[PDB]
Symmetry: C2
Subunit: 304 residues, 2 copies
């Protein structure tokens, strides 16, 4: 047998999955993420692998999804959310202990790869995963394989600046220029995310509603929320059309909180054509199938 | 033997190249591009293949580079530059006549694939080819393979709008907003290309010098040309840093006229870090190693 193991590392939990040669899930496990020592963090992962190995009588492949990246030169984890593993050579430590290769990828990449491997999307020459939550996260898939990038930065679409046409819609010099955690300004991370949705409402209407609350007022017909959504759908169209002119994805999968706003799936095909090239055609744009359980699938599939 | 044939279709000439299994170039030929009939155009290509087949005693693969695209649904060529072939199903017509598959790609993709297949760059997980000439052309390579995109639009980086930070450098509301052949405005096609270099000089200094002429005055120390280059290098840095945040290429290859301006290769490493993510690392940035054989090499390599 071939066996693919996947780990999704969260601040609170570690999710584990084993997948057979047909990508059928044959093991499922959730343990607390050790916040204490690094040795305990290692122990959690290593014990899960060795048990699965015994149970299935194989040496499964090992893929890991992390909220952050491994420094492409040192191997050191850059993950503010996992205190125990922050600054450790996780790949090297596990490869020594597990006597086999280990792949570690950002969760945005794992999300994308999970979606891209649905029976529906296999064969697609390219898939772009977008996560619209606290920030804008991206994962670029080409022929079923994660493009990680030179420094494991590929898909950081969130830290691209508002294009000219988006600035024009927001009023050029009068357009709000939001600060970014990357210390840059005008990043689309603070416009097209759930947080961005909120921030833009607050700027123009001087009130702090959460995204679900703005959406609720939209549904009731409130002038302000209707005006916001109209602005936002257009801004989303403009920004994505820019990214699509560069990337031309076959399929675009949306995840994270704001991906729940069903209006996006009807309004994007209507507003995109005006901003794409005349000869350009619309990608298939769907909501993510796997919600939160994608991380393990994606992690496992790093080794297909 | 395997043989790969490549064709680069120009308005005036059709170039042809044959490559052996080790990618050694074993034939080169050039015929006039028929401007008259489509049948004559077909004849030019078909005759070149049949002669090569006789000479090498094989049925070579056939890849073709075009200044434009084939409509991904109809197969019809969209190439204003080749009147005889404009609007014809070139792929299907040649497959019928040559009794084998035929691949047609934009020349910007062929350039990139030609560069990516250099001995140096084999094994590179990703390569971005950029052509800074009359316009900005891009070609996205992942593990030695062209990413064409959903409608063959992938890599049209030229028709992405100036990012916010580029607009800031050019003076926001006072920043010149150049029209674009795509009927959109603010496209970087009219800023970062050779033509763009000229257009930006002309805007700020009210004089029509060609790029080599501006470069010459830079070399002599002329106030105006020094001011232009400073602006341009920063604008180039800003724009590319945006694209790199999204794509994170391992290697970036520059082609086209402005790629001859050697100052680019020293000034880009110096100005990029300020505009990339703090954790981001610089791609290898080199001048094209295969000038004008790129169309034929890349065309042929579509079939590797
Ligand atoms: N059903 C929903 N509809 C609309 N917005 C939502 C919904 N659920 C959450 N959000 C918004 O999404 C944002 C947070 O997104 P969420 O994806 O839940 O973030 P997270 O838990 O930090 N994970 P991540 O996706 O990595 O950012 C907030 O701005 C919420 O208001
Ligand atoms: N050696 C050079 N140094 C600087 N600029 C140059 C040089 N050669 C050409 N250019 C400029 O590049 C532009 C034309 O680029 P060039 O690559 O020659 O165009 P093309 O062959 O007509 N089209 P393309 O190959 O698609 O870029 C003009 O602005 C020229 O001034
Ligand atoms: Zn940012
Ligand atoms: Zn354009």
């Amino acid at each position: 047998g071939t066996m693919y193991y996947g780990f999704d590392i969260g601040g609170t939990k570690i999710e584990f999955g084993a997948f057979d040669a047909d990508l059928v899930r044959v093991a499922r496990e959730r343990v607390a993420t050790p916040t204490e020592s690094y040795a305990a963090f290692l122990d959690a992962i290593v014990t899960l692998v060795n048990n699965a190995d015994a149970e299935f009588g194989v040496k499964g492949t090992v893929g890991i999804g992390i909220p952050g990246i491994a420094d492409v030169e040192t191997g050191k984890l850059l993950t503010s959310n996992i205190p125990a593993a922050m600054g450790h050579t996780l790949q090297r430590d596990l490869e020594e202990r597990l006597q086999r290769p280990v792949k570690i990828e950002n969760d945005a990449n794992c999300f994308a790869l999970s979606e891209a491997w649905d029976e529906d999307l296999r064969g697609e020459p390219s898939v772009l995963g977008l996560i619209l939550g606290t920030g804008v996260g991206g994962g670029l898939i080409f022929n079923g394989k994660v493009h990680s990038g030179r420094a494991n930065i590929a898909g950081e679409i969130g830290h691209t600046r508002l294009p000219y046409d988006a600035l024009k819609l927001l009023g050029m010099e009068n357009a709000p220029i939001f600060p970014c955690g990357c210390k840059n300004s005008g990043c689309i991370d603070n416009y097209l995310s759930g947080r961005g949705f909120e921030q833009l409402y607050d700027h123009y209407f001087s009130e702090k509603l959460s995204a679900p609350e703005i959406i609720a007022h939209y549904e009731q017909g409130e002038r302000r929320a209707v005006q916001h959504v109209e602005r936002f759908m257009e801004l989303l169209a403009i920004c994505l059309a820019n990214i699509f002119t560069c990337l031309d994805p076959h399929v675009v999968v949306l995840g994270g909180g704001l991906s729940n706003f069903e209006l996006i799936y009807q309004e994007l095909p209507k507003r995109l054509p005006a901003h794409l090239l005349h000869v350009a055609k619309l990608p298939k744009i769907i909501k993510a199938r796997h919600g939160d359980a994608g991380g393990v699938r994606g992690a496992a599939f790093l080794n297909l």
